[PDB]
Amino acid sequence: PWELTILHTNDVHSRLEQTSEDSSKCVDASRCMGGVARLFTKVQQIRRAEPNVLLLDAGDQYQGTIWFTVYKGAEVAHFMNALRYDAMALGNHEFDNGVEGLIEPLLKEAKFPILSANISASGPLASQISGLYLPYKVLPVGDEVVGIVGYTSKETPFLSNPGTNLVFEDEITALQPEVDKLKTLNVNKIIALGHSGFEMDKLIAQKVRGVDVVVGGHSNTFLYTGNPPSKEVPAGKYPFIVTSDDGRKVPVVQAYAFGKYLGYLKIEFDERGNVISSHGNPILLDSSIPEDPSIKADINKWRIKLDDYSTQELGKTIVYLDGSSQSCRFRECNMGNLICDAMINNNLRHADEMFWNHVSMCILNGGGIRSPIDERNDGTITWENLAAVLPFGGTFDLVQLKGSTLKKAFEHSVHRYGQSTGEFLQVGGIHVVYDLSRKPGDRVVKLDVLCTSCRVPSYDPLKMDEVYKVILPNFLANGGDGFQMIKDELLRHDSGDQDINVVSTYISKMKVIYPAVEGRIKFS
Amino acid sequence: PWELTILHTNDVHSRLEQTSEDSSKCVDASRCMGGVARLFTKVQQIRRAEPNVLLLDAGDQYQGTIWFTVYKGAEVAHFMNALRYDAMALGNHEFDNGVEGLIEPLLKEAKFPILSANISASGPLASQISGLYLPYKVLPVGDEVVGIVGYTSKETPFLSNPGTNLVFEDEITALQPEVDKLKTLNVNKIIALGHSGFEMDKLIAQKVRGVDVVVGGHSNTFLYTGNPPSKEVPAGKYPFIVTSDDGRKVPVVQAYAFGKYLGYLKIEFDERGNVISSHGNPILLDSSIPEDPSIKADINKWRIKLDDYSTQELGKTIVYLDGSSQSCRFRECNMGNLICDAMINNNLRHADEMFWNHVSMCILNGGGIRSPIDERNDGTITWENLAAVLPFGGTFDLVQLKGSTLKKAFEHSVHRYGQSTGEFLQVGGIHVVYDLSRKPGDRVVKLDVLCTSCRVPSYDPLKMDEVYKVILPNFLANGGDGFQMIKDELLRHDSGDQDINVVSTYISKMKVIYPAVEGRIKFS
Ligand SMILES: O=[N+]([O-])c1ccc(O)c(O)c1
Ligand SMILES: O=[N+]([O-])c1ccc(O)c(O)c1
Ligand SMILES: O=[N+]([O-])c1ccc(O)c(O)c1
Ligand SMILES: O=[N+]([O-])c1ccc(O)c(O)c1
Ligand SMILES: [Ca+2]
Ligand SMILES: [Ca+2]
Ligand SMILES: [Zn+2]
Ligand SMILES: [Zn+2]
Ligand SMILES: [Zn+2]
Ligand SMILES: [Zn+2]
């Protein structure tokens, strides 16, 4: 048998430096984890021991920290080149700075192939990008070859800024003919590497005939065989075994997010490229693995421009930005309005004749707003100032919620009103009226929401059966501050942009801000 | 006696081309008036006949039409140079593009002195601007000399964008020592030329000892001796005679606005520079005076870039901009919200610890909103599109109104609701609730306004005795659409920027707009 070791990352999301256990800023070095210097050590160790190794990334290196804000993907090309990745699939966040922000920093500077079989271009863009990403690439491994066919979420136009030329085809439709082609070219070992989420990964494993293993991403899925090594709870075994339509067992893998784990799968193939066995587990990149000193020193050199950027003026406020808990845990606060307005502006995507924009609504728990910003420093706002307001390194995510779920969330928001608890909601595109004299669970007396399927945005009563798109912190999507109904009842959840970055981009676009308290939240 | 002929303009406000009788676009050439080509003819004729002539401008050539939007003051230097102005005082609107937008296009290119004795600079700006404007200039006229001392509204920081270096001193305080100095230098004929308004002009005539004649502006004041020649109603005789504190009679002149009239004052002086007599009248520049063909041809050449600019994309909308009368004369309309938001953004000026901004409030009659803009031209908005919405060439002005006056205006807004009449008000920084079941004059049941003297903007009930700053069309400041209470009760009124220009600047700043209907106006 011929044994291949697949090492894989996904959804690293700009975690160049080691992180805390919950993938926020590293504070206690002895408990820190991940980062590219530590990954380098582990990858180098495995490549010394195993003959046939591929190191693969399933997309979403872009977006997540000040690294991406400042270096705009140059850090991804540089550090992925240093680790000697063998291939990468395009993720949705690779389009966050448009097609231009993908071509210049990453496609032109990567020393490895970048893959997606289900993205097509037309007009001048087609000529401009031809060959800079590929549907697949056949790689030599020892005296053998392995084909690697890429794919990217069909939902990318709703989840990033790819622009109106690129077309994202159904993944299975696009993949099958490429896998068929590889079989005709005597490539009998085929990895599907791509960025659509665990559910689609299982469908690809089932339906794309000739795929031997699926290496996925997007959904931040943690899979594990045995006792988990940290706080992440497995969604299933590693690998997850799909029974294909052709009758074969097909392993599906993912490795969480944020560079906390290195995926590790060993596959035995027969002479005809059939999988005989597969086994492995993600490896927790904890402090027992030393950071490579060379990579760490290069990281520290690149950090100088981040420190410089962090104290520069992003824009100005002419108003006090009231992020005090005495305001934002009790009533509408203008810092809450600012952040929700920034969230909505970040999620302006291309729209049909069917909607002015696909999403119009925002909620933000007051517990997540951690400081005010004073306007009397000549109005200046810096990244450092925003990091005091939003210190946890989270994202502002897109979810789909029934109106009934959103009504329960607003009842939760005031169920124990008066105690300065975190669950009180700041809003955008929502007007709520509470009557605190009513019983807990029955205090919401008016709830109106901004239409999407309308040419003129206006407010309509929330309907209980309708499904609404909402932008909210990942903390709330995961049931934080007691919002278990959001976690348990949401229909769809896709990870968004970094919290500080969303607000910084809005302030830099606006140049001078003046958010008011305007009646989004009222009391009877 | 030595006779001087003073020819003077003020508040021309970018009316390079001839205009209609009400200083909007020229449609019927036989009834058009003003413009620089016609002014050239008249000035040339007078200079052939009179030996001792000065042609003076009292400021506010900047701001008023697409000429200023495109050429940014280059048109002012070019055409004032062609007419051979002898001197100009700085007006408030000369600061609309900051100090940089005054220095480069106008102070560096004018072939005549530009004057203001009550503006001082500090730090590097003082060195940068030294001598580019002057407190006064002594001009040869025949075998005599005439001193001309300039002044500019002390309120300019509230009415333009001069920036935080320049200091605007009290006019009389700054003028007297310069007039004293000129007397010590044997200059016995002194004109005060400046831009503070008729009321301040009369105070200067009264209190600045040694001023022989005041040539003013800013207030668009029409003065006339006899039967007026057009629709403007005189505020007093031409000249207006002030009795000075030194006992002398001092003539005060102004010549309306928009280049419709050329001021013409003949002054007889004795050997000691005392005024013996003065007489004259503004000359209506009607179609009986031919346009100079050379100047007209140069105007037509400069117009090519205006035609090109007018169809360029300013920015995008992702929403239908509902400027229909069926919406904007009956309920809150999103075109009204856009225009009022643009009005407030245009009036963001430098602020103390006493206010986030000096003005927070806007009203706009639905009768002034003349078209929608459809978003399905790839979202594009052009100047031509905005000119369909705002076709009358007006301004968005700053007024001070008691709360009682503003309550009467909102009662007027709905006094005959249901007939599609123009007086229904769109708003910014105001939330109104009507109950149409109540008697006319008693239909406003809630009226809340955005604070100014606050670090966090929020809404408070309107108080009847408080004086509020409001941004509104000149049409309403002048009592249009039946708003006689505004005209008769306002405390202060200063002319603002051109209506289309205000909206175009906002759209270009924002890049992508999405105004909603949000509850600024509600009905019980
Ligand atoms: O936000 N900052 O200022 C940062 C963040 C990460 C860094 O490594 C840094 O050197 C500065
Ligand atoms: O980050 N949050 O949202 C938090 C953090 C601490 C809290 O006590 C909380 O209730 C919410
Ligand atoms: O608004 N435009 O398009 C204009 C306005 C004035 C002009 O003289 C012109 O040639 C075009
Ligand atoms: O320009 N306006 O505001 C107008 C123009 C015509 C009207 O009939 C009116 O009621 C208002
Ligand atoms: Ca195979
Ligand atoms: Ca004199
Ligand atoms: Zn991701
Ligand atoms: Zn993703
Ligand atoms: Zn003026
Ligand atoms: Zn003025």
Q: Coil, strand, or helix at residue B314? A: strand
- Where would I find the H helices in A160-238? 171-184, 198-207
CA distance A444 to A436: 8
Q: How far apart are the first and last CA of chain B?
A: 74
Q: How many residues does chain A have?
A: 524
Cβ(B189)–Cβ(B85) below 8 Å: no
B514 touches chain A (CB under 8 A): yes
Q: Which residues lie across from A353 on neighbouring strands?
A: none
B350 marked among binding-site residues: no
Treating both helix axes as pointing N-terminal to C-terminal, what angle do B198-207 and B171-184 enclose, rounded to 10 degrees? 40
Would the CB of B217 count as within 6 Å of ligand 4? Answer: no
Q: What are phi and psi of A48, to 5 degrees?
A: -70, -30
Write down the residue that tokens 């002057």 correspond to. Answer: B134
Do the strands B380-382 and B430-434 form a parallel or antiparallel pair, or are they unpaired?
A: unpaired
How far is the centre of ligand 2, averaged over its atoms, from the C-alpha of A368 (Å)? 6
Q: Rounded to 5, what percent of chain A is helix, strand, coil?
A: 30, 25, 45
Among B215, B208, B213, B216, residue whose Cα is nearest residue B190: B213
* Among B357, B447, B514, the residue to mutate for chain A (most A Cβ within 10 A): B514
Q: How far apart are the first and last CA of chain A?
A: 74
| Residues within a 6 A CB radius of ligand 3 | B 17, 66, 303, 306-307, 310, 383, 387
CA A452 to chain centroid, in Å, comes to 24
B212 touches chain A (CB under 8 A): no
Cβ contact, residue pair A457, B322, below 8 Å: no
Among B424, B394, B431, B472, residue whose Cα is nearest residue B325: B424
B:427-456 residues touching chain A, CB 8 A cutoff: 431, 450, 455-456
How far is the centre of ligand 6, averaged over its atoms, from the C-alpha of B118 (Å)? 21
Q: Rounded to 5, what percent of chain B is helix, strand, coil?
A: 30, 25, 45
- Which mutation among B20, B22, B25, B365 tests ligand 4's pocket best, with the greatest number of atoms within 8 A of CB? B365
Cα B277 to Cα A476, B53, B241, B246, B340: the distances in Å are: 82, 16, 11, 17, 49
Residues of A in contact with B517 (CB under 8 A): 456-459
- Where would I find the H helices in B145-189? 156-159, 171-184
Tokens standing for residue B497: 């920027």
Treating both helix axes as pointing N-terminal to C-terminal, what angle do B36-49 and B74-83 enclose, rounded to 10 degrees? 30
Please give the interface size between A and B, counted as residue pairs whose CB atoms are below 8 Å apart.
73
Cis bond leading into B239, ω under 30°? yes
Q: What are phi and psi of A219, to 5 degrees?
A: -85, 0
Q: Coil, strand, or helix at residue A155? A: coil
Of A322, A450, A455, the CB nearest to B456: A322
CA distance A227 to A123: 52
Treating both helix axes as pointing N-terminal to C-terminal, what angle do A499-510 and A334-346 enclose, rounded to 10 degrees? 90
Phi-psi region at A284: left, alpha or beta (left = phi > 0; alpha = psi -120 to 50): beta
Tokens standing for residue A128: 């401009």
Write down the residue that tokens 């944020």 correspond to. Answer: A258
Tokens standing for residue A243: 């029974």
CA A332 to chain centroid, in Å, comes to 29
Q: Which residues lie across from A431 on neighbouring strands?
A: A448
CA angle B50, B51, B57 (to 5 degrees): 75
Among A79, A98, A101, residue whose Cα is nearest residue A88: A79
**Number of neighbours of residue A43 by Cβ within 10 angstroms:** 20
Atom of ligand 4 nearest to the CA of B394: 1
Of A320, A455, A458, the CB nearest to B375: A455
In DSSP notation, B204-240 reads HHHHSTT--EEE--SS-----SSS-SSSPPPSS-SSE
CA distance A303 to A317: 28
Cβ(A446)–Cβ(A433) below 8 Å: yes
Helix (H) or strand (E) holding B363: strand B362-365
Q: Up-side HSE of residue A376: CA atoms within 13 Å toward CB?
A: 6
A514 touches chain B (CB under 8 A): yes
CA distance B152 to B164: 16
Annotation: binding site of A for Zn(2+): 11, 13, 60, 92, 195, 218
Alpha-carbon dihedral A524, A452, A334, A63, rounded to 10 degrees = 140
Write down the residue that tokens 């964008």 correspond to. Answer: B161
Q: What is the 8-class DSSP label of residue A392?
A: S
- Which mutation among B69, B306, B500 tests ligand 3's pocket best, with the greatest number of atoms within 8 A of CB? B306
Among A176, A6, A162, A17, residue whose Cα is nearest residue A90: A162
CA distance B221 to B254: 6
Cβ(B52)–Cβ(B2) below 8 Å: yes
A461 touches chain B (CB under 8 A): no
CA distance B524 to B518: 16
Of A375, A459, A514, the CB nearest to B518: A459
Among A213, A189, A190, residue whose Cα is nearest residue A202: A213
Q: How was this structure determined?
A: X-ray
How far is the centre of ligand 6, averaged over its atoms, from the C-alpha of A109 (Å)? 78
Q: Coil, strand, or helix at residue B260? A: coil
Cβ(A432)–Cβ(A447) below 8 Å: yes
Q: Which residues lie across from B195 on neighbouring strands?
A: B152
B318 touches chain A (CB under 8 A): yes
Treating both helix axes as pointing N-terminal to C-terminal, what angle do A74-83 and A36-49 enclose, rounded to 10 degrees? 30
In sign, the C-alpha dihedral spanning A89, A92, A95, A99 is: positive
Residues contacting residue B184 through CB under 8 Å, at least 6 positions apart:
none
Sheet containing B430-434, strands listed edge to edge, beginning at the edge strand earlier in sequence: B459-461, B444-450, B430-434, B521-523
How far is the alpha carbon of B500 from chain A, nearest alpha carbon, in Å? 21
Q: Which residues lie across from A242 on neighbouring strands?
A: A250
Write down the residue that tokens 């690294």 correspond to. Answer: A67
Judged on CB neighbours under 10 Å (0-12, 13-18, 19+), B336 is buried
Alpha-carbon dihedral A70, A76, A82, A87, rounded to 10 degrees = -170
| Residues within a 6 A CB radius of ligand 1 | A 17, 66, 303, 306-307, 310, 383, 387
Cβ(B281)–Cβ(B264) below 8 Å: yes
Cβ(B221)–Cβ(B198) below 8 Å: yes
Of A357, A431, A515, the CB nearest to B519: A431
Residues of B in contact with A459 (CB under 8 A): 516-519
Nearest-ligand number for the alpha carbon of A474: 2
Of A318, A356, A456, the CB nearest to B517: A456
Chain breaks in chain A (C to N over 2.5 A) after: none
Cβ(B319)–Cβ(A458) below 8 Å: no
Write down the residue that tokens 């000529």 correspond to. Answer: A127
CA distance A443 to A437: 7
Among B267, B191, B257, residue whose Cα is nearest residue B221: B257
Tokens standing for residue B34: 């003003």
How far is the alpha carbon of A340 from chain B, nearest alpha carbon, in Å? 15
All domains in chain A, ordered by first residue: 5-303 (3.60.21.10), 304-523 (3.90.780.10)
Among B108, B178, B122, residue whose Cα is nearest residue B150: B178
Cβ contact, residue pair A353, B376, below 8 Å: yes
How far is the centre of ligand 8, averaged over its atoms, from the C-alpha of A190 (Å)? 23
Cα A58 to Cα A10, A219, A220, A311, B200: the distances in Å are: 5, 11, 11, 34, 73
Q: Coil, strand, or helix at residue A407? A: helix
Resolution (A): 1.1
Alpha-carbon dihedral B201, B206, B209, B211, rounded to 10 degrees = 40
CA distance A463 to A447: 9
How far is the alpha carbon of B348 from chain A, nearest alpha carbon, in Å? 9
A351 touches chain B (CB under 8 A): yes
Would the CB of B368 count as within 6 Å of ligand 4? Answer: yes
Amino acid at B211: V
